[PDB]
GROMACS .gro file of C-alpha atoms in nm:
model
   98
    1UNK     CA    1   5.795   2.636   0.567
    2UNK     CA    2   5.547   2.432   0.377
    3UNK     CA    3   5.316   2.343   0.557
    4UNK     CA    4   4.961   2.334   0.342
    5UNK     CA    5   4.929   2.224  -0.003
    6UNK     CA    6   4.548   2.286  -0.186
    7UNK     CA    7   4.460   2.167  -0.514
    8UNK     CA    8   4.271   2.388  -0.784
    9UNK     CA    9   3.913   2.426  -0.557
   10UNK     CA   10   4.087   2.481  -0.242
   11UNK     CA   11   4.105   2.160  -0.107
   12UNK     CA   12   4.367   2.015   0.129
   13UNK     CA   13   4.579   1.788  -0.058
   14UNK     CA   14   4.866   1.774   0.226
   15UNK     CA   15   4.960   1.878   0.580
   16UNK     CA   16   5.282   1.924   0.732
   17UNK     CA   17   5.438   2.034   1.048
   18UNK     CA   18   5.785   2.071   1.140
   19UNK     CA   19   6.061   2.057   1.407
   20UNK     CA   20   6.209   2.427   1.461
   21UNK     CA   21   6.547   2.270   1.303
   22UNK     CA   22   6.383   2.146   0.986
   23UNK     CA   23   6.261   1.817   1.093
   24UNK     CA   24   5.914   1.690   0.969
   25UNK     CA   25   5.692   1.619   1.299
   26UNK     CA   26   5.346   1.589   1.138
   27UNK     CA   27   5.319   1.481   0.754
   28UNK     CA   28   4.963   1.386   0.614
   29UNK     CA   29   4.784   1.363   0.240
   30UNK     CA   30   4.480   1.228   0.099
   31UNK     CA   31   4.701   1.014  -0.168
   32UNK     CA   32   5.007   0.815  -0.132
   33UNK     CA   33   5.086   0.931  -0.473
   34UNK     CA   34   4.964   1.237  -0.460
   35UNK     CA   35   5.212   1.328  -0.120
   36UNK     CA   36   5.527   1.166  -0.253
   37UNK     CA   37   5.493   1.492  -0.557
   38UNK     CA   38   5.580   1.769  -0.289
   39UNK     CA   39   5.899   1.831  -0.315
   40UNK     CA   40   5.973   2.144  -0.115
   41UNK     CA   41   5.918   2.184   0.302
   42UNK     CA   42   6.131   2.386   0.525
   43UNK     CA   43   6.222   2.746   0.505
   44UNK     CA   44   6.120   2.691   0.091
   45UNK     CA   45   6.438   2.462   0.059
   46UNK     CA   46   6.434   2.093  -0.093
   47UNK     CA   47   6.454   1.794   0.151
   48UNK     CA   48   6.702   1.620  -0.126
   49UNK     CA   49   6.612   1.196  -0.103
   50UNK     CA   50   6.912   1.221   0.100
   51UNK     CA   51   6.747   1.340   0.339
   52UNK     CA   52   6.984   1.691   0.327
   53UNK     CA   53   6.785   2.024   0.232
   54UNK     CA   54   6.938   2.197  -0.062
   55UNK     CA   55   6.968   2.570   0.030
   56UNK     CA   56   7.186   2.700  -0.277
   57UNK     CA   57   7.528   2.778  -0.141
   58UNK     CA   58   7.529   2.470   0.098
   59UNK     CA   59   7.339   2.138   0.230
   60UNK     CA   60   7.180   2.151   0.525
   61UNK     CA   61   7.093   1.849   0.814
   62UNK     CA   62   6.776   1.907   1.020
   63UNK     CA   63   6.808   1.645   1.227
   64UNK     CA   64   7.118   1.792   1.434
   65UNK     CA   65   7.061   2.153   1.300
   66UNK     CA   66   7.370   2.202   1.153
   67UNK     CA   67   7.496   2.312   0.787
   68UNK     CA   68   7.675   2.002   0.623
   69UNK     CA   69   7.998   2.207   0.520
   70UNK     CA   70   8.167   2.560   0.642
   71UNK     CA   71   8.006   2.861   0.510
   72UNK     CA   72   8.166   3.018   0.262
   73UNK     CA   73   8.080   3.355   0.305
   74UNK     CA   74   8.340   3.338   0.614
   75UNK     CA   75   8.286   3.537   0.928
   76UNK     CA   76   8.001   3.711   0.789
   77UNK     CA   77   7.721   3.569   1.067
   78UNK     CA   78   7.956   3.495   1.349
   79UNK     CA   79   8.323   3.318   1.395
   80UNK     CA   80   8.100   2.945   1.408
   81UNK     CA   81   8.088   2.826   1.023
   82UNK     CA   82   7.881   2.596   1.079
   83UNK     CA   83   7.572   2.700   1.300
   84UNK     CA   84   7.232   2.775   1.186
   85UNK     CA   85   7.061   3.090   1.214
   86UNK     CA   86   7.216   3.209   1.534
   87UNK     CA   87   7.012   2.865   1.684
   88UNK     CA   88   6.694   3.045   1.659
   89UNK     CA   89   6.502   2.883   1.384
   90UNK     CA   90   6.228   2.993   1.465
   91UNK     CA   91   6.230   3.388   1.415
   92UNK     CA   92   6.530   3.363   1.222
   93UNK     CA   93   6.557   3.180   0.811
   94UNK     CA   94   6.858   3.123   0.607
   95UNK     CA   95   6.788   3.243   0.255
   96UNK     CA   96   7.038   3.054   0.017
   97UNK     CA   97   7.260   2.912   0.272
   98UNK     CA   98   7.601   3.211   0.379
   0.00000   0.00000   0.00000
């Protein structure tokens, strides 16, 4: 998860901080502009405008920890097709979204 961005002299241009589910908790910059440029947050996965993070083989919604559509990779991490990470986000990470 993103969580510090620094510009070319090491110098903190963001801060973020994150529910375990994908949430943003804390999110601070030193620019308006220069914040609204970060594009990626969670587990290295786009927060679309939507408010859905893009994971590659499905969306995902932080905000009830759930994948937006049944995996397609099938019964390959349990009979549930739709949890996340075995619900433990925060040892586990979902690399491209099976």
């Amino acid at each position: 998860s993103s969580q510090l961005e620094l510009d070319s002299e090491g110098q903190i241009i963001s801060e973020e901080e994150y529910y375990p589910y994908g949430g943003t908790a804390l999110w601070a910059a030193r620019n308006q502009t220069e914040a609204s440029y970060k594009t990626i947050r969670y587990s290295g996965k786009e927060r679309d405008a939507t408010g859905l993070y893009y994971y590659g083989y499905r969306y995902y919604q932080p905000w009830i920890g759930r994948w937006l559509s049944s995996d397609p990779a099938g019964t390959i991490d349990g009979l549930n097709l739709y949890r996340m990470v075995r619900n433990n986000p925060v040892t586990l990470l979902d690399p491209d979204g099976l």
